[PDB]
């Protein structure tokens, strides 16, 4: 009998914090066990739930609850007892669907990254589907067992003799060179090369989705406005020396390929030689490349309606002049976010954009006019079309913008909590698998430990980053309770069901 042998060596390792390790261990072997069950039992049960990214988060539940229960005792034993119980089969498979589920935790983790990015960021904004999901984990699975099989063939159980002897279970390797050059290999793909790969890519969505396009809710507000909208434009032409009229207005600098003002002069020097211009009035609010501002500046000196600014105007202003223009002209060449569009149309300013980027994603038939980027002409004929509708009320019109980008912002704010729960997930795996990752090269690659001052504290180090491994499964089904409110409420639901009968 192994276990008599251990009685036996008990004596010279003995740990009077077993009982502290026992505790932990049971804990998170209850938390990350039934969290995950639910995990699973909330993304199969609901089917507003089955998104690309809950499928993969559905994956990372499997490989936790895969080894919780085929693992966890066994590695508990193993650091308490110093002893492998088990057989030389299991010496093979434990370590093997251990190792498995780490490679699996972290393809899928770069997995949710990539799909988050290819449709926040990039261009195309890619929406997957449930079968390419599925086609991706089923992938995980196959590139996780082939090459995690180099681990279970080192694996060996062997006889140590500390007369009473050991049974252990560890990587058994020909030669001092192969080991380290592995667990190089092991640190990149596990950890290293995903954490980096994460670490570019939630960066991007962050300053997309907090800052490029995260506009401010309490600011951009119609109710800060007062009167109604003709009192306040007549107000404001009035100040600029103008008559009444439909109102145009640019905002943004002076640029060469970017913003477009060199686009909207030209307009302007079209629409001019037409009776029609003499309706309209034309606020162009900037400053830099000097020729364009002298462009602009003549124009200005020749025309009684239009007028350039190009001192700084502070937000209440430029919100002001958003809820009293009749339109807002954007004619980028490249504008990914559209922020200048969200903001106006929160005042009821009627857009005349360019059809690229986020304009093309913002502006709808129904809510604004658009336009081919770079090209006059066209820009021109939107001003004219302007000007037909503000013949007529422009106000369903208007309140059609409000509620545009009130829901284009809402949807920013959906993803931003999206995104910041992943980005927790991604920050608590570092924490998590930074120590025994770090500690495996330590050990396998540098030769650390060896020769030891303080074998003690050096078992008690990996026997808590062991704990904390598992730890971090126990802890995941915690962060989608407290940062996604549809895994919370289904959480809610499973209980009631589980403990009482009721249906939610
Ligand atoms: C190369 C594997 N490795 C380093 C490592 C870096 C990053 C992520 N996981 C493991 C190890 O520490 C080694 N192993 C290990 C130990 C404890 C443990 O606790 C969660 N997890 C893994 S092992 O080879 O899988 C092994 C060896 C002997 C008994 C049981 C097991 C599972
Ligand atoms: C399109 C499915 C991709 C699956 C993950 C593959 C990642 C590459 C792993 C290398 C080791």
Redesign the pocket.
Same mark, same amino acid.
């Given at each position: 009998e192994e276990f008599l042998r251990y009685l036996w060596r008990e004596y010279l390792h003995p740990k009077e914090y077993a009982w502290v390790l026992i505790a932990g261990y049971i804990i998170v072997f209850v938390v990350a066990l039934i969290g995950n069950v639910l995990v699973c039992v909330a993304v199969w049960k609901n089917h507003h739930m089955r998104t690309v990214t809950n499928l993969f988060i559905v994956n990372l539940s499997l490989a936790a609850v895969l080894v919780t229960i085929t693992?966890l005792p066994?590695?508990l034993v193993?650091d308490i007892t110093e002893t492998?119980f088990f057989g030389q089969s299991l010496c093979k498979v434990?370590?093997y669907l251990? #190792?498995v589920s780490?490679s699996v935790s972290a393809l899928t983790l770069s997995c949710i990254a990539l799909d988050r990015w290819y449709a926040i960021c990039h261009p195309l904004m890619f929406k997957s589907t449930a079968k390419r999901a599925l086609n991706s984990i089923v992938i995980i699975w196959i590139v996780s067992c082939i090459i995690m099989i180099p681990?279970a063939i080192v694996?060996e159980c062997s006889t140590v003799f500390p007369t009473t002897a050991f049974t252990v279970?560890?990587?058994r390797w020909g030669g001092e060179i192969a080991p380290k050059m592995y667990?190089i290999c092991?640190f990149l793909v #596990?950890?290293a090369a995903p954490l980096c790969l994460m670490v570019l890519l939630y960066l991007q969505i962050f300053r997309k989705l907090w800052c490029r396009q995260g506009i401010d809710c309490s600011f951009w507000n119609e109710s800060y406005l007062t009167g109604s909208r003709d009192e306040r434009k007549k107000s404001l032409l009035s100040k600029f020396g103008m008559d009444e009229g439909v109102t145009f207005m640019f905002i943004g600098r002076f640029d060469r390929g970017q913003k477009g003002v060199d686009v909207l002069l030209k307009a302007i020097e079209i629409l001019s030689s037409k009776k029609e211009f003499q309706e309209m009035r034309f606020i162009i609010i900037g400053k830099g490349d000097p020729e364009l501002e002298g462009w602009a500046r003549s124009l200005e000196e020749k025309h009684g309606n239009v007028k350039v600014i190009t001192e700084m105007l502070s937000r209440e202003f430029v919100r002001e002049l958003y809820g009293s223009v009749d339109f807002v002209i954007i004619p980028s060449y490249f504008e990914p976010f559209g922020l200048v569009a969200l903001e106006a149309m929160c005042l009821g300013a009627i857009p005349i954009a360019s059809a690229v980027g986020g304009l093309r994603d913002i502006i709808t038939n129904e809510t604004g006019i658009l336009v081919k980027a770079g090209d006059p002409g066209e820009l021109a004929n939107a001003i004219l079309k302007a000007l037909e509708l503000s013949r007529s009320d422009l106000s369903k019109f208007r309140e059609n913008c409000k509620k545009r980008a009130m829901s284009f912002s809402k949807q920013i704010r959906a993803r931003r909590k999206t995104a910041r729960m992943l980005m927790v997930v991604v920050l608590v795996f570092a924490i998590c698998?930074a120590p025994?990752?770090i500690?495996?090269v330590l050990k396998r690659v540098f030769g650390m430990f060896a020769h030891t001052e303080d074998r003690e504290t050096v078992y008690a180090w990996f026997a808590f980053?062991?704990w904390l491994?598992?730890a971090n499964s126990a802890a995941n089904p915690i962060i989608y309770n407290f940062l996604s409110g549809k895994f919370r409420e289904e959480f809610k639901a499973a209980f009631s069901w589980w403990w009482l009968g009721v249906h939610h």
């Open positions: 693992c066994a590695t193993v492998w434990i370590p251990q #190792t780490v681990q694996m279970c560890d990587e667990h092991f #596990t950890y698998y025994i990752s500690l495996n980053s062991h491994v598992y």
